[PDB]
Amino acid sequence: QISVRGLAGVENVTELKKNFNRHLHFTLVKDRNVATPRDYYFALAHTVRDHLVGRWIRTQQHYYEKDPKRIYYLSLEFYMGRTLQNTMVNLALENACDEATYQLGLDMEELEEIEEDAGLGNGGLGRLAACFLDSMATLGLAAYGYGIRYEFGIFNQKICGGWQMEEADDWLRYGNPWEKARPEFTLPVHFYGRVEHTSQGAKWVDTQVVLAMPYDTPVPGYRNNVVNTMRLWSAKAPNDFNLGYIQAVLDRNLAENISRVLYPNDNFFEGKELRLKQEYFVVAATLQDIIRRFKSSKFGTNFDAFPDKVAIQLNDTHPSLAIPELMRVLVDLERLDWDKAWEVTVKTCAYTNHTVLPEALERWPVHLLETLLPRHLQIIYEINQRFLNRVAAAFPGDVDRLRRMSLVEEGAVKRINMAHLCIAGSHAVNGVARIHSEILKKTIFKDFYELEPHKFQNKTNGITPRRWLVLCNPGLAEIIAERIGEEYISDLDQLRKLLSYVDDEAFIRDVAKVKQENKLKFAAYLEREYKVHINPNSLFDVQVKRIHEYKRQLLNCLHVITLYNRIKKEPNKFVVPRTVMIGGKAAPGYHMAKMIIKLITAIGDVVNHDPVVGDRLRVIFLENYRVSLAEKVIPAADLSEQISTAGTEASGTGNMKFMLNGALTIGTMDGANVEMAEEAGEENFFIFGMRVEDVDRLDQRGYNAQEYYDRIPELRQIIEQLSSGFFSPKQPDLFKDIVNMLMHHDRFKVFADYEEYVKCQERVSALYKNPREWTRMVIRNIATSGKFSSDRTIAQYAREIWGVEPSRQRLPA
Amino acid sequence: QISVRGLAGVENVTELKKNFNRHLHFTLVKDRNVATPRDYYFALAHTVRDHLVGRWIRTQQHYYEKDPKRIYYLSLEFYMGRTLQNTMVNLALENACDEATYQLGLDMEELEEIEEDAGLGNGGLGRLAACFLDSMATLGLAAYGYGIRYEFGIFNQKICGGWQMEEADDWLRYGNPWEKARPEFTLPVHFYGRVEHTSQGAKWVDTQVVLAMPYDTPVPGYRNNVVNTMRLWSAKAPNDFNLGYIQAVLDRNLAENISRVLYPNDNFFEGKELRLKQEYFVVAATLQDIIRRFKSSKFGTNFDAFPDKVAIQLNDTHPSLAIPELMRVLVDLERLDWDKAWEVTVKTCAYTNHTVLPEALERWPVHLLETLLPRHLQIIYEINQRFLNRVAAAFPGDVDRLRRMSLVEEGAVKRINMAHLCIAGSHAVNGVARIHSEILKKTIFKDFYELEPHKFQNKTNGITPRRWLVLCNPGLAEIIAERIGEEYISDLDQLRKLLSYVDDEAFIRDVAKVKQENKLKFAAYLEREYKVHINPNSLFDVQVKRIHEYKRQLLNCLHVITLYNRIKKEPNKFVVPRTVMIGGKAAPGYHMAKMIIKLITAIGDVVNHDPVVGDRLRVIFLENYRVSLAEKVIPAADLSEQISTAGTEASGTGNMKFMLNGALTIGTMDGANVEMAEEAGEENFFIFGMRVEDVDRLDQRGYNAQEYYDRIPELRQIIEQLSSGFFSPKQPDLFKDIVNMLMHHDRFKVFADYEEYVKCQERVSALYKNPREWTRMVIRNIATSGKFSSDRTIAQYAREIWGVEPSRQRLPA
């Protein structure tokens, strides 16, 4: 149908149809008389999968022959979403499959909806890893994603009585056609035990063994015939495990629990033993795999060349045990001297920090490491001693610096600071947006920056334009391709060419048409799937992201109520109609975040049924926000809410997705918002609120929320409404926790940005009244979004950290 | 190579080779440079599997169109062994695959050894179910095997220091290419809860739900294009299960433990809750499936026709809950009156008894059923009351009969007798050999036989001649086919034609040649796989079966020691050389059986290293006896030990396997031995020992083992050797338990058959000295083994119990 979706050749369509029928019969053991839509999905998935394997086998063969430097991206999260459409897009198969299925009497879009999300992540950190895999393959890098194959990913969110309920995400129930089990490459992982000292050094003995079984998933590059591997480990008990008889077999579950479930915490550290086991499990299995592959190479025994052939990227501190595990292997098993092993380790490892929030920092109790990983604790102590000797020599007599920089934190319970471990043992440390990387050097890692300035870098985050434009917004990709061609899909900077169309009346009309079509499609989706009714002519005001105090969904709530109260006061006055959509999951143990969700639904319950309001204001909570829902709602958005307190959102990536898809942004000067506004021009962004410096000034003086309550009558009214039970008539004190927090212990200064936020929102409404000028501003946003491609981000990692050159050259098909 | 293995056509060989290469590439994601023998096995398995599915789909389609009476064979055990060779044989693909693989440069026999046994059974009962599935498909019956997909089957047995060690049988590790998961047909199963009474009758409420997910495996008939289904249920937790968060997800294991492991007890009842859950789980899921299929039929709401369209065969009492579950569904859910529901139930269900040993009888504590299955207990009580009212009316005033026949057993703990439940609720009750069925009517079920004589039948067990001749002994199948053609493979009675060759010098030579070849092949297998050395010219004396006191492996041990002692006494006297092979698993909790294994190895330790003995006597314990090992050792055997105490082995099936494969039998008149001797002629069998009547006489008088010890000096010497530590010098009292049992509490009268056994063994040795007359007796055995085909057995079930007619007619290919 559309150009960007590739060719539908007579030869290709015929071949796809017959392979579809082959899989339905031989693979699924079905005929057309018993087959369900799910069977049809699987037959298509297997058909597309077949096209991958040839390229997969020759890509990996190519790496064996050429022996390039390999990049190992270690992450506890890979938030992949659905794979079918992504694979079709990257292989140029979308139109052909569309034609083949049409001729078989099936709707491909209907089949696509059957696939489960691979929800092996929480939010931004996990989705960044997924975008990175796509870009690394597209840029022809010899890259491997390594993680855990969780049996249960992020929970499915149900809303019951306005409250979040969690249910298990049994994503593997019907099987996963994309993975290939590799039980032949199973590796042992050790836990507990004790350290024995001999003449030949230390020995780790009396350990419990858990097996790590790898599952490989193909990662196709964009139309370059490169297919990389994501390898995920699954925990398996050994066959002599605990070997009355029946109980010993049933107790195998204890070992296998390691890969059972993703911890559903976003930006929050929970110090549980099972989580530590997960972290070591991925690290130990991966490093064995890396070393095996290094020894079995067409190059060289000699670990001097190890950093020339291997890069390990630590995604946050979660895989930080890679550092002492590499030391363990090099010193204890390979018998390298400490100094040499350390040189190799430092030159191999690099660390990406994702947040400055103290509650998110991993600080593991020494007693846990002592029991679980006794040799690693000894190695960490030795790393610390040698590191602090360096600090002492550089800053003689500075005794407080020594305590501040120690990897060992003293107190009631001794803890290991994993972030400090990562900096000491890595040659590169990067933040994820310019303002964030600056904050790291100025505040939390100031001491480390003073010691080793060369180590500290910035790599501004990005998103893949394949999933986040071509896949989810084909209508916009097409109208862009009509004007400037198809090259921008792997060279997003080319979108700048669109600035010469900002005064083009045809383009203006097409951009606005694509948005309305997206809005209609999403309005219909909401009716069919959730029986909720919205006005497609209203401004689509959306905030989608994990529920957090720092992300200030509560500030959004205050504005919504302000709008409602203003309507009730002057009912017959004209207001720009809005649909306010808020979605996202709260961590199961996060009480305040669960209360915020309840508040949002409670506001909807009042606002959506007030006859005086009409269709002028609607508040909808978007249930079960996840990658597949993001791909639907983002193309439909007019306004993107990026309203975190300045200095708290390290980067954000949702912000970039909205920019690429034709929404305007209301936001604080936080994370990547700053660089986005810089790229588009501040006139083309709705910036408001305190800057980082203003927050600091308020902290020094002391934040008093009462001041704002006293001086802003509209704010006072809302608080009174909340307190008195206006939004909860049956349970008048339901929101007392929220009010108390806002008034007395608000770390994120909701009230301080309220006035500027509301005024800025008025300016948004004013512009939306002028469709032509709204769209012209949109065009200026899309046209300058090129910097935020993860291809740019990965190219910078490649050149400035990993020491490898990216390549757009095709492999032979 | 050989005729019986089918045609190797140029067209077929070419097609197999290319499909092999397709699977290696697309299915396994490998090329010839990285592929291991295991990869090659899987590519072949997938290639052969493809040939099944077409026939599988049209067989099931055929049953839907014709709507025949369906046979449901319910069993907690299906001891299937390997599937690759069986599938090739039944599809006439063996020579073609042999040629195709040869041309690809691979040895097919080597690939066959890679397949794991499907070891979902303990011994005879589980293997009978497997043979039955084969025969039902071969006879064109619309039959379904229903069971549990155990994650772990029967344990792998390792021998360490002469002791049995158990390890988990992780048979699914590398995947199972033969099964097809059917998550779309998942069914709920209920546990616990309570019974509520309404105006509309009883309601079972507040239950815990466990999901039953089916996996389907094809069962091909012998060259008739019929492919039936074995459906095995797997336990799955529902997604809202227990839904802090992490623990609730981890607790899903509790529900899924139901299908985790096979109870490794042979002929022994262990009253554990998990076992009861397994028994109900299979029954509840199966009956829902049966009823669904009955309602969705081209026939008829009206349950009058239910017994005309459905037969349920209960394999032992393990699925006995089918009876009250069918009543539950008919009365509580379908709202049929009791009397009508009961008529339907009785006409639908039939029960096969497998043993008379009291320790094997299922007697479930009422308190377990009360908690787990409260509605079923109520139904059982009602069944009992109505049944006892019938007994009371037939035998007025016979109060002891009432207590003897009750389904409820009174005592310290109240129990339900599941065997009594089965008889009451079935229209047919059968034993598994003529002597066994007679014992049932005369002893343990005498009261029931008096009430309902018409209910009681015999169905002598059998074995499939496909697996147990063609597959495991191609050499013998071929020399037979040369003389009488190929028809005997599905009409085993034709082997009688071989009696006209008993004086044929060519045939005599060929039979003896096939045996020597089998012996050489097995002698080589033992060296390659277990580094043990045997003389292939010796008499292969084998006892392979589960280790049990009733099977009297100890009587064999006494003979072995007698032979050793006789050699030591007259070293320079000639004796017929023997290799005595004993193999089989002991239940993990069965102490005496574990001691017997230790004894056997301890005898070997002395006998095998005595220089005076030479190669005249060897005692070898065959480790990890299982279906695949049976297929190797049985064709190699000269002498089959079937020496259970008369009246204890209900039938035996191992006995039949040895008869079909050219071994002579030494045995008691027990189980099917009686019918075997009757078929071949007593002159052609080595029968010894007490008959049932002699055992009874000894019981009435009182068995005194001391009498035998006092009067038999050779027996006395052995006991002294055991007691003094001759077979355990470092631990002199090691075998005190065995001696004590033998002397004071021997339920199975080992000593009473010792004299006759030893004398009979002398007659065996005498005949073996005359190769020509040994072989002529062998020919008389093979020629009369036709009755013991499971095709005969299943034809009798079909006609006399299920009311269906068998068919040898081909389905179209």
Ligand SMILES: Cc1cn([C@H]2C[C@H](O)[C@@H](CO)O2)c(=O)[nH]c1=O
């Ligand atoms: C589970 C969870 C709890 N919390 C709770 C624990 C702390 O008491 C509080 C932060 O001060 O919020 C989070 O902030 N984030 C989370 O993800």
Ligand SMILES: Cc1cn([C@H]2C[C@H](O)[C@@H](CO)O2)c(=O)[nH]c1=O
């Ligand atoms: C596990 C097991 C134990 N036993 C034990 C339990 C009883 O105490 C004894 C039989 O009297 O043997 C068996 O006989 N068979 C078995 O399978």
